[PDB]
């Protein structure tokens, strides 16, 4: 879609649908590469798309399991992470056009956010009332755990300064954590 | 024994001739295994491709003799793989549709066993059918999961995903 905005007054339309990409199966997540135009969609299979092509330019998938969410890295723009329905987190690298690593957790993770100030760190919203801070290079151990929520954590986001995260939960609350502490400093 | 004796089919195919020659060679080499190898005989064989580029040898056998094959299936399978490399050898019986499909699946997974079966219904309307196997011979079957999927798709015309729980693959 295209939207007319009033940021600048250097001019003075075509506001509406620009292009449509059809897929074989239902889609479940979308995110766009920061540096370039390519974007990735997660449905039954995670597909890499190019804006100037109507079909998926590349097919990425660890296996037959579907993908429920995905998020592009913010600094190392070629790295991507996704979440499966099989309680898994898969890492991709577009420079190789292939997945890289997979870890299976005890419960499904609903969202992923990459640290804006640290290219190799990402936090995951999990369904066991917890959010987990991970290092890309060593996924055996978590860097931190955030435990304050009492229902499933459904979304997570980093502050652009990279010192805080905010979590949304099924328990009708929003909690803000300091990345160096495992407990929330606030609830809304 | 002639290879044609092993082959129940009146008009044997060349590949049947080769594999029957393999069986009779095993019989002659075998000092006492021949006692069980000689009575055993097979109806036909199907060489069916796999995603990796390999092919699998589905040996179609009568059920009463399939029991005796299963008694001695392991040694025959290993020996046939030695004679025929690039070939995954599997012994299947020729046989309601759900029951026969399940029996075909059990014949495929042999010597391994089916721990479970699941069907995941996605939001769009797709279905992922999955079969969970045991970890008895995890390495060997892990080298053969795709062959099982290809064989089951070829024979039953169904899409199945073979998983080995307790291991992350």
């Amino acid at each position: 879609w295209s939207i007319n905005v009033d940021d600048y007054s250097n001019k003075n339309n075509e506001e509406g649908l620009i292009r449509t990409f059809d897929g074989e199966s239902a889609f479940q997540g979308i995110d766009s590469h920061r540096e370039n135009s390519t974007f990735a969609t997660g449905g039954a299979k995670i597909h890499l798309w190019d804006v100037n092509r109507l079909k998926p330019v590349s097919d990425l998938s660890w296996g037959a399991d579907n993908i429920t969410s995905l998020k592009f890295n913010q600094n190392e723009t070629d790295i991507l992470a996704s979440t499966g329905s099989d309680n898994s987190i898969v890492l991709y690298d577009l420079r190789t056009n292939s997945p890289t690593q997979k870890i299976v957790q005890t419960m499904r993770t609903n969202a992923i956010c990459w640290n804006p100030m640290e290219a190799f760190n990402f936090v995951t919203a999990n369904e066991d009332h917890n959010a987990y801070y991970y290092d890309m290079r060593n996924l055996s151990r978590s860097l931190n755990v955030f435990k304050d929520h009492v229902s499933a954590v459904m979304d997570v986001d980093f502050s652009p300064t990279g010192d805080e995260i905010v979590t949304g939960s099924y328990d009708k609350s929003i909690r803000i954590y300091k990345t160096n502490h495992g407990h929330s400093r606030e609830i809304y | 024994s002639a290879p044609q004796a092993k082959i129940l089919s009146q008009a044997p195919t060349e590949l049947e001739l080769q594999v029957a020659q393999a069986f009779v060679e095993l019989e002659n080499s075998s000092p006492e295994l021949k006692a069980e190898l000689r009575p055993l005989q097979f109806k036909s064989i199907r060489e069916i491709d796999v995603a990796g580029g390999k092919k699998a040898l589905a040996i179609f056998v009568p059920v009463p003799s399939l029991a005796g094959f299963h008694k001695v299936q392991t040694k025959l399978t290993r020996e046939l793989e030695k004679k025929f490399q690039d070939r995954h050898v599997i012994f299947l019986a020729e046989r309601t549709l759900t029951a026969v499909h399940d029996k075909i699946l059990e014949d495929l997974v042999f010597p391994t066993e089916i721990v479970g079966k699941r069907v995941r219904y996605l939001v769009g309307g797709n279905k992922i059918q999955k079969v969970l196997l045991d970890s008895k011979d995890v390495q060997q079957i892990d080298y053969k999961l795709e062959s099982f999927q290809a064989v089951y798709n070829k024979l039953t015309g169904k899409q199945i995903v073979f998983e080995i729980p307790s291991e992350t693959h």
């Binding site: 870890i103 005890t106 419960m107 917890n130 996924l139 055996s140 151990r141 978590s142 | 992350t168």
Partner: peptide, 27 residues
Amino acid sequence: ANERRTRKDMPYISERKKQIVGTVHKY
């Protein structure tokens, strides 16, 4: 805590490692 009084082999698992069921590439 009661188990550890009598349990000869009960390992200590950190809270950070508890959620991981497994990983594909071991290091």
